[PDB]
Design a protein around this ligand. Structure first.
Ligand SMILES: OC[C@H]1O[C@H](O)[C@@H](O)[C@@H](O)[C@@H]1O
Ligand SMILES: *[C@H]1O[C@H](CO)[C@@H](O)[C@H](O)[C@@H]1O
Ligand SMILES: N=C(N)N1CCCCC1
Lengths: 10, 236, 236
């Protein structure tokens, strides 16, 4: 999970 | 959603929770009904788990808490992710989902209209974000669907607030100069909708952002008008 | 582990928990670090969930409590199951996980020596099983790692008890007839290490046997000495 990731796991 | 409030049954009848069932089941992503057999979401939602058997899609629900294993699921007949989508990039962030069974439309489960290719430069004044994401950074998935109005930040002013990253014309940005209103983790694949002629239109799909509702860090959304030829192609 | 007691931080630094992460996390299996990038485990740990970007590997921790978002975790780059493993049968029950980033060894996290091919038929005598598995049939997963010693039982003594199941040279058995000390759920893929010449070496991988320390029901373990060819062949 980068900085921009809106994605739930992280 | 950062900086919003409970929605009601039937306010946003196009919004769906996409869930993964492994040892246990859990909400991961939003999406929008655009037809009986068709759901539109973001490519990044299936980054890690691209197996459609594994996925469950749920509509006409206000809280995830009201989804059990005895609840009827829509299932993925077909998962179409834009060929140009690269798994660790923000470009071409859009996926189509053909359901196994056409949905029965109700007060609570309705498709949203898509814009013309012709609506590409149209200026929307009344735009909403919805989903079950985090209300704060370091937050947690919500039970009750959240909503928030957000102003579109024009693309040039959005570029200059993300020097590190590259804003496409096929992207569209939303947020306040400071502001606590934004999409967050768990809002991935959800709709930015605007009212243009007194009706609602999917204008954007929640894609990526630096943090949630940080000062002058607007959310970035796949701009659907710009993929309308891709949508006709893959749906016939 | 059944009949076990609290292991101690550093006692078994090759031990890893294998966990499935969505948003939640569940300890499902154990494995053994044998390399900077290599973990050895059971093929049947991935029968139900064979998707790699859902697995997380934690080394050099004593309790699962220790773990929150803070806690760093390896990820599967490659998952190599034995080509001859069949979910129907419990033969060839061995898998290699290739980690994405190489491991940085410490006092708490170190490989373990594989046996040598010629060591087949050697009788090992200082034998330990570790894991976070159930301490009783129908029990629950353990917060703190459990160690337990155990005698091996040779094949043909073992094959007597498994009337319908074939116990072959690629397997080891271990348990006390009236002993009730054994490996239960969640210990699968975990190490059976027998100290020999002067250092601990991985002798077997926790495999099967419905039941946990039933009198006259010894644990079956994949015999690591018979897959040295395969393991080195797969670590080109
Ligand atoms: O959005 C309205 C709705 O929000 C939530 C609760 O506050 C309810 O009592 C209220 O009716
Ligand atoms: C330990 O050391 C490397 C050095 O970069 C880390 O990046 C990685 O986390 C590894 O596990
Ligand atoms: N809108 C924001 N801030 N986002 C979009 C969803 C991914 C996380 C960042």
């Amino acid at each position: 999970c980068p900085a921009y990731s809106a994605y739930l796991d992280c | 959603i950062v900086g919003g409030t409970n929605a009601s049954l039937g306010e946003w009848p196009w919004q769906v929770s996409l869930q993964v069932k492994l040892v246990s089941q859990t909400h991961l992503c939003g999406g929008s009904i655009i037809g009986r057999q068709w759901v539109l979401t973001a490519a990044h939602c299936f980054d890690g788990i691209p197996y459609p058997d594994v996925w469950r899609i749920y509509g006409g629900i206000l809280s995830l808490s009201e989804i059990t294993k005895e609840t009827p699921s829509s299932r993925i007949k077909e998962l179409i992710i834009h060929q140009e989508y690269k798994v660790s990039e923000g470009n071409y962030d859009i996926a189509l989902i053909k359901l196994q069974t056409p949905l029965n439309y109700t007060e609570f489960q309705k498709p949203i209209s898509l814009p013309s290719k012709a609506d590409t430069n149209t200026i929307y004044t009344n735009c909403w974000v919805t989903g079950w994401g985090y209300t704060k950074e370091q937050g947690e998935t919500q039970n009750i669907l959240q909503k928030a109005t957000i102003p579109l930040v024009p693309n040039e002013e959005c570029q200059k607030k993300y020097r590190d990253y590259v804003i496409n014309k096929q992207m569209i940005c939303a947020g306040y100069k400071e502001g606590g209103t934004d999409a967050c983790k768990g809002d991935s694949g959800g709709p930015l909708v605007c009212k243009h002629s007194g009706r609602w239109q999917l204008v954007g799909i929640t894609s990526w952002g630096e943090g949630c509702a940080r000062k002058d860090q607007p959310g970035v959304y796949t701009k659907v008008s710009e993929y309308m030829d891709w949508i006709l192609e893959k749906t016939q």
